[PDB]
Design a protein around this ligand. Structure first.
Ligand SMILES: CC(C)=CCC/C(C)=C/CC/C(C)=C(\F)COP(=O)(O)OP(=O)(O)O
Ligand SMILES: [Mg+2]
Ligand SMILES: [Mg+2]
Ligand SMILES: [Mg+2]
Length: 515
């Protein structure tokens, strides 16, 4: 076809490229540590402050300290009474962190009529926090179900009369919640709004420097991956293949940005790249008769299968077996090989579902509704990315972790729903369409369809939140992988490569922050 190329060209290829500032960093870090443990004027300020530490992208340094503060605040509360702001932010932060705070804390804010009290509509700061906090609602919490609409409405009505920076913060929240945003894309935006009165000087400085140090690190990782990709030469060799390596790395850097997951991003990014090439190969001038050997050789995964596939497919097969064979070397130094087979297996599952999707488009065979229902969720590859993301995490991950991920746990389901359903609407809205099928099956309209699909996304989100409420099926760092994948969707597939991918790639990878 028309091979490649990335819109980024060689911007990221070459390796990227002050000790005083590193010493600053080390020192600010301890200062910020101590302002988290030390008292503030009251519980609300301690809460606001932790919120900022989280929103500025640096809470990963202070996980235990922040946790201890939140436990105290949970076990030591006079619900009666905090404002709407104190109640909301406390409910949001505690729920994010797994504490079972009842939605009844919002009862107090209604009139006997059952409408939201009149006073409430005037408390913008309180509406913002309530707005944000209602993205933490799970099932059976109608008050927060009402809150989201109530607050959405009255906030758009107040944007006009607001003075910066509060204005910016509102307009932004109606576009992007704190909860479904990608921590790092949001961090870059809050760094700007936080700089604008009474903000903590040392927080804001540490977060600026930390942001650049990480950016440096990612810039190193992305250069190692691009050099890797450049040698594959999928340019001449695979005319029909897109080039989405940078966009992949961004997706994956959303699964985890932290320093400790550096090997993770590396392995994960190669995987998603090959997945892409595999996807495209099922979506090119491959005929079905070529796809069954291909899929067949993927199922058996052995270099000997390379002689059994059409010549044009050998380069993707060899690249593919090479990625995993490498994952095994990189992870051998702690005897974590056993993780790789699980990831192989998920790639294979994914390729089997591509085979079926392909037969449908190439043989134009209209599937019944539940034939379609059964085969659609596993074309997503979020099970594959979650599972594979574990390969390069630390000891928190365990053979049991892979036994749980393979069994389809509620948190991977929820993220799959979110993926499959946002990806469909987004395609129709802006061959084989879930919406197109829903329209035929129940005889409704695109809009009425969008209605039902989004209604499902929101319920999937409620399941997701719920999966963090203690006790949990798995450690938090295991669940965040799935949360973050759900966040990649909300950020990247809502109303190429898109102003969203381009916009985020620039702020996290190209433009540093002026100290
Ligand atoms: C996604 C980027 C880079 C920017 C955002 C722009 C938008 C809204 C893209 C929606 C199109 C898209 C990538 C898909 F439908 C994924 O289909 P894919 O072919 O990737 O997987 P299948 O589900 O069709 O097998
Ligand atoms: Mg595709
Ligand atoms: Mg496809
Ligand atoms: Mg698609």
């Amino acid at each position: 076809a028309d091979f490649q190329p990335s819109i980024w060209g060689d911007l990221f290829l070459n390796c990227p490229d002050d000790a005083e500032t590193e010493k600053r960093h080390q020192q600010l870090k301890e200062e910020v540590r101590k302002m988290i443990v030390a008292p503030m004027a009251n519980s609300t300020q301690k809460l606001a402050f932790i919120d900022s530490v989280q929103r500025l992208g640096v809470s990963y340094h202070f996980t235990k300290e922040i946790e201890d503060e939140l436990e105290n605040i949970y076990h030591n509360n006079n619900d009666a009474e905090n404002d709407l702001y104190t109640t909301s932010i406390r409910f949001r932060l505690l729920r994010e962190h797994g504490y079972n705070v009842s939605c009844d804390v919002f009862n107090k804010f209604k009139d006997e009529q059952g409408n939201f009290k009149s006073s409430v509509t005037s408390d913008v700061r309180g509406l913002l926090e309530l707005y944000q906090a209602s993205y933490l609602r799970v099932h059976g919490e109608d008050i927060l179900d009402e809150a989201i609409s109530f607050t959405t409405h009255h906030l758009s009505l107040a944007v006009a009369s607001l003075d910066h920076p509060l204005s910016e913060e509102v307009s932004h929240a109606l576009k992007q919640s704190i909860r479904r945003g990608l921590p790092r894309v949001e961090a870059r935006h809050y760094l700007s709004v936080y700089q604008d009165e009474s903000h903590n000087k040392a927080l804001l400085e540490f977060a600026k420097i930390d942001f650049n140090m990480l950016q440096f690190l990612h810039r190193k990782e992305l250069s190692e991956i691009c050099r890797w990709w450049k040698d594959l030469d999928f340019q001449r060799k695979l005319p029909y293949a897109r080039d989405r390596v940078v966009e992949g790395y961004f997706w994956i850097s959303g699964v985890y940005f932290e320093p400790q997951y550096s090997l993770g991003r590396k392995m994960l990014t190669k995987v998603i790249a090959m997945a892409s090439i595999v996807d495209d190969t099922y979506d090119s001038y491959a005929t079905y008769e070529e796809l069954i050997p291909y899929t067949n050789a993927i199922e058996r995964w052995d270099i000997k299968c390379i002689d059994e596939i059409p010549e044009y497919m050998k380069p993707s097969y060899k690249a593919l077996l090479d990625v995993y064979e490498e994952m095994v070397q990189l992870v051998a130094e702690h005897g974590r090989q056993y993780r790789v087979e699980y990831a192989k297996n998920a790639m294979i599952r994914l390729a089997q579902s591509y085979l079926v999707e392909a037969k449908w488009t190439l043989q134009n065979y209209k599937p019944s509704f539940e034939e379609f229902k059964a085969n659609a969720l596993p074309t997503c590859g979020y099970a594959m990315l979650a599972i594979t993301s574990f390969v390069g995490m630390g000891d928190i991950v365990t053979p049991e972790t892979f036994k749980w991920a393979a069994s389809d746990p509620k948190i991977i389901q929820a993220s799959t729903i979110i993926c499959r359903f946002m990806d469909d609407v987004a395609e129709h809205k802006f061959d084989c369409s879930a919406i197109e099928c829903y329209m035929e099956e129940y005889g409704v309209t695109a809009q009425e369809a969008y209605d039902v699909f989004n209604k499902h996304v929101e319920s999937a989100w409620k399941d997701l939140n719920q999966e963090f409420l203690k006790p949990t099926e798995m450690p938090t760092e295991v669940l965040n992988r799935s949360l973050n994948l759900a966040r990649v969707m909300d950020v990247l597939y809502r109303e190429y490569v898109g102003k969203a991918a381009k916009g985020g790639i620039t702020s996290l990878l190209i433009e540093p922050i002026a100290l």
